[PDB]
Write a protein that binds this DNA or RNA. Structure first.
Ligand SMILES: O=c1ccc2ncc(=O)n3c2n1C[C@H]3CN1CCC(NCc2cc3c(cn2)OCCC3)CC1
Ligand SMILES: [Mn+2]
Ligand code: NA
Lengths: 189, 473, 481, 190
DNA sequence: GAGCGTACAGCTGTACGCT
DNA sequence: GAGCGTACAGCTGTACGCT
């Protein structure tokens, strides 16, 4: 679709950055180290794999592009050893709409590519300020993408039972449980 | 490391809360979602009043996008479009020039082609906004200031209604008749312990811009009592072999889509007796859908059940109260609004008094300067600098720093004959005005009557006939 | 009623064609801008978006430009603005943009809602003295706004940044140039109206592209300068370095102007994949923010790198021609011009701007002198002035009494009535005198300019010289002879 | 795309060709839906004087017009099978509207010439000064432009076939020189 | 060749709640 | 069911001249 791959073919050192669009993707391609860093810009709010049926999930374009880029497959057919990159970086905007896209991507990773999380290949990038689609190439590289200066947060799965419940509650089709979570945890101040 | 449960809960709670308090739900005070409030404030800042000519839509959207609303252009434009449609807004808030869409779901012309300005009644939402009535907040980037709420001198939430899909919850509030609402608020203002049943003597029920009929008062009452309920909206249809003519459709029904479903019915042989289905609707003629009958009451009743010719309005009055989403009944909605008006008018009076007193102080200084001008000039003339002159005026004439400053800022043209009488006349009027404002701040009942009067004026200026007929039986 | 199809086609097509020619696709000879570009830069000026001021949102700019000046699509406006901010498109960028404004690989700029923009420092020189009646203003499309017909343009912008434009019945394609060279050329021309193109080219070597690279020969340049039409071969900067074991590789660090880097590499890979070229083993775009443009073409042991490189020039955009076609608007009409014509039209434009600016300054200074003279009379006889005003029942009577008594003009009388009491203090009278004295000095300096065309022309020279010293830079494109 | 009219009688029916949905909305709301159809195009249509035949037939916009008129093209063209006796060109009142009109007339001349000869092809006269037809309200657009009682349509008349052949070829044709010549011959600046 | 660069024009996914 | 209404995101077709 619009994947800019890293030149190297050794996954142990390669990393793919998932961005929200071409606005973020453009800056990212300029600033990246094209030897070890790939960039996959999606096309915004991705499908919710908790609510959506498998027919639609497998039909989805951004889902298909991610599956192709990783080269692992989904489910039992998923293979960790066939990962094209040993760092899959979620780089969402900054804003609240980014946080949402973050939860949609982690929902997809948990449900269809759980061993990818388990192995510790899934990371969250932290942009320094508003969106990272408004950043220059040099600015974005130094702050977020430079392995010398960056701060990537490794996603870790602790309790499988508790995590199964979390996804079902937040991202599931039953509104009440999600309304309840908001009511219990929201601090308006 | 980052726990996956912790990240999911926090990142999702961030979005959910944001959508709830800053996107999908209207404030109870002014009935506006953020994007609507940002459009209207933009129009006001750029002086796009009804008396002034239509301004290019693209220029409004860019101004709103640049300063207030860091979101997509389509989000802003479609929101502005909707406030300008007389079939969407019971009291339209935007005055639009060009193609702004139709009842058939046709969108508005690209924003490069449309022009817009405030409606007369939008001025009343923004009235007194520069009089310290509402609290201003930094914009998203901290370069600009924006209002947290509009003064909203008319109850806009109920008048115009609201529908919003949030997270964990949603909103669906039907529009109402302005006259009925203000009458309802006036009633409330006299009887805090007023019941819903009593309120419904003023507010008979919803009032849709598209008019039509409501079946019974049961749905209305339950929606007004609890904040939730089904209200049956029925098309206005008359019978005249015979044909059925529909002149009014339910609120939010796409006219073209509804016809397609009637045609889809007859094609699927789901209904019997329909021979012809034509849309003879023109802007000049108005809404006119004709359904010819085979050689009609049974068919029309069948259409109500099987087509959107009769549609339910599922009422779900959730709004932001004190920055929190709250399911509210009719009384709560009016109480929260009236309490907002009481605050608006109080704060305006405080501001006004503060402004008048500051001015009456200035005038006192000018009078002394004009009454003893020969001395004033020499004191100024004998001075070397402005500072020295400032000190000399304060010492010799017992003036304040502000008074002395205003004297040095006085022009020579104010030395003329009529000028002294002009200053004293303005001053006498201030003294009485100051007196009026203090009475309002010193008696709750006087402040409350001032609200009543101001509301009544808007009722008398903007109040209109009810469009939707509520049929009992 | 009735309309002949022949008449309709001729009328409608001429209507469109003329409009594209004069009001779309072709740049003015004087400021070197198209309508859209001049409306962007003017828009930036009106809303006070200067280099010292902070960036403003691109959506707000495009909205202001669209609403006031340019009744066209946002795409056409925004994309025009983006170009002026690209250091790979503009030799002297006219817009300062923060965010993703595109790359040489041809990925577009971020949507206008992410980006912010403002003027560059040289754009101030395009707009310098625009509010001083140097250029004529005309109504806008709707007639509710005024817009400039041309900018003062205090540097030769047509030749500096160049232009390309597909019109109707014709087109334009003008290469960018070096500012130090151009101004030196204008100075030379100003000193010799009968100077030759040949002699002009001693200052102006040839095109200077923001993308550097190499120009092959000088015959292409000469012809395009002589006739306004010519073909100039632009070559990439490529070197061949030995790698040991007889190995070699081609390293490309500069590519021809207006060439898409990614697309050029795709073409190379297309030739290698189809086996249209022989000897290439690997192709890597090692372009980074640290190195700049860098394309590495690995070469097989047996193959000769020089032959491969030469073949790459023929078969790919690695060598590209720039087809010069110098059509600009002169007095509102499309004209194919030579290098001298373009410089001449500009010099005349500067002379007018400087002459009109001086005339404006002389008008304002004399108005201000008239006012100060009235204030001087008023302060010198303040006791009489006060008494005259105080005995007056209205402002109108005071007006008449001041004019009669002190032989003052109406404007002088108004200024006295508009005078604040704080002006009667000690420091202020010396202030009015000091302002008035240096004003008289200024008035005579302006008269000296308007008295002698030689003085005026030297003024033009000196201002261009100041713009040359501040904004002039090195030649980037190497012309190999 | 096509917002057809109710009447299926070609003699009393008219189709309006507009530049898009922005104009199409105004037109659809203002129209007499009994006898007035509306087909919104999508900006500059194909120059059929320049394009190859393969590209013309596959062109979506060209196809929609042929389908709307229901006549066919060239030799297959049947004037009797025309579903509209008035094909009205209603481009925006600007220079680009004038261009789209020349592109449309070019198509009509080359692919559906009998339509012009029968006098089915008209040119609308919208009020000047408006940015687009989408800038207009439906009520004003109807009264001034679309209402048979007040409107001023221009019937496209082919008086000279040989002169027309040369006119289209010069203006719309592949050779620039003939076009540049005409522009130099005729252009009025001042 | 094909794309340079100002012009014209428009569509389809996605989330989220309710009923 | 599917759409109501604020949010996220992006692409393709046309004209035109030139080498
Ligand atoms: O119409 C279509 C059909 C398909 C399609 N595919 C990709 C794509 O990007 N687009 C597609 N489209 C359209 C375009 C999306 N369009 C949405 C509106 C946006 N407008 C930007 C804008 C305009 C204005 C602004 C701010 N931003 O304020 C000032 C005045 C006007 C530009 C991109
Ligand atoms: Mn148009
Ligand atoms: Na390694």
């Amino acid at each position: 679709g619009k994947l800019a791959d890293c030149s190297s073919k050794s996954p142990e050192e390669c990393e793919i950055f998932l961005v929200e669009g071409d606005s973020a993707g453009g800056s990212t391609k300029s600033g990246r180290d094209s030897r070890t860093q790939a960039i996959l810009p999606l096309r915004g709010k991705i499908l919710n794999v908790e609510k959506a049926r498998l027919d639609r999930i497998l039909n989805n374009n951004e889902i298909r592009q991610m599956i192709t880029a990783f080269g692992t497959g989904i489910g039992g057919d998923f293979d960790l050893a066939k990962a094209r990159y040993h760092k899959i970086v979620i780089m969402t905007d900054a804003d609240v709409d980014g946080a949402h896209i973050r939860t949609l991507l982690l929902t997809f990773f948990y449900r269809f590519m759980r061993p990818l999380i388990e192995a510790g290949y899934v990371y969250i990038a932290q942009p320094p300020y508003k969106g990272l689609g408004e950043m220059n190439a040099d600015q974005l590289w130094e702050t977020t993408m430079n392995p010398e200066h960056r701060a990537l947060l490794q996603v870790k799965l602790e309790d499988a039972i508790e995590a199964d419940q979390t996804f079902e509650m937040l991202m599931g089709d039953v509104v009440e449980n999600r309304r309840q979570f908001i009511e219990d945890n929201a601090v308006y101040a | 490391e980052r726990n996956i449960t912790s990240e999911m809960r926090e990142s999702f709670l961030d979005y959910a809360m944001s959508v709830i308090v800053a996107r999908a739900l209207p404030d109870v005070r002014d009935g506006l979602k953020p994007v609507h409030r940002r459009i209207l404030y933009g129009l006001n800042e750029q002086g796009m009043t009804p008396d002034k000519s239509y301004k290019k839509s693209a220029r409004i959207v860019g101004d709103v996008m640049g300063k207030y609303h860091p979101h997509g252009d389509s989000s802003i434009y479609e929101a502005m479009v909707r406030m300008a449609q007389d079939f969407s807004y019971r009291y339209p808030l935007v005055d639009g020039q060009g193609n702004f869409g139709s009842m058939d779901g046709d969108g508005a012309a690209a924003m490069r082609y449309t022009e817009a300005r405030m409606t007369k009644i939008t001025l009343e939402l923004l009235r007194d906004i520069n009089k310290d009535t509402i609290d201003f907040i930094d914009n998203y980037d901290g370069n600009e200031r924006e209002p947290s709420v509009l003064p909203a001198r008319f109850p806009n939430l109920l008048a115009n209604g609201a529908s919003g899909i949030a997270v964990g919850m949603a909103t669906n509030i039907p529009p109402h008749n302005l006259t009925e609402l203000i009458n309802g608020v006036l009633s409330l203002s006299k009887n805090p312990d007023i019941s819903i049943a009593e309120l419904m003597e003023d507010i008979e029920g919803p009032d849709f811009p598209t008019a039509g009929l409501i079946l019974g008062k049961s749905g209305i009452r339950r929606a007004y009592e609890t904040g939730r309920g089904s209200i049956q909206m029925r098309s206005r249809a008359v019978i005249e072999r015979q044909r059925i003519v529909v002149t009014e459709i339910p609120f939010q029904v796409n006219k073209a889509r509804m016809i397609e479903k009637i045609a889809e019915l007859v094609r699927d042989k789901k209904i019997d007796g329909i021979t012809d289905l034509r849309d003879e609707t023109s802007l000049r003629t108005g809404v006119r859908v004709v359904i010819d009958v085979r050689k009609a009451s049974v068919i029309l009743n069948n259409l109500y059940k099987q087509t959107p010719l009769q549609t339910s309005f599922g009422v779900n009055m959730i709004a932001l109260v004190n920055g929190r989403p709250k399911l509210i009944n009719l009384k709560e909605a009016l109480v929260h609004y009236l309490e907002h008006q009481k605050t608006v008018v109080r704060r305006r009076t405080q501001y006004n008094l503060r402004k008048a007193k500051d001015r009456a102080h200035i005038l006192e200084g000018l009078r002394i300067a004009l009454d003893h001008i020969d001395e004033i000039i020499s004191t100024i003339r004998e001075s070397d600098t402005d500072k020295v002159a400032m000190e000399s005026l304060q010492q010799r004439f017992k003036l304040s720093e502000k008074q002395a400053q205003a004297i040095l800022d006085m022009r020579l043209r104010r030395l003329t004959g009529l000028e002294r009488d002009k200053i004293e006349a303005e001053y006498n009027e201030l003294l009485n005005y100051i007196s009026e404002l203090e009475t309002i701040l010193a008696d709750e009942e006087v402040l409350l009557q001032l609200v009543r009067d101001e509301l009544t004026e808007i009722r008398d200026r903007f109040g209109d006939d009810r469009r939707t007929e509520i049929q009992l039986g």
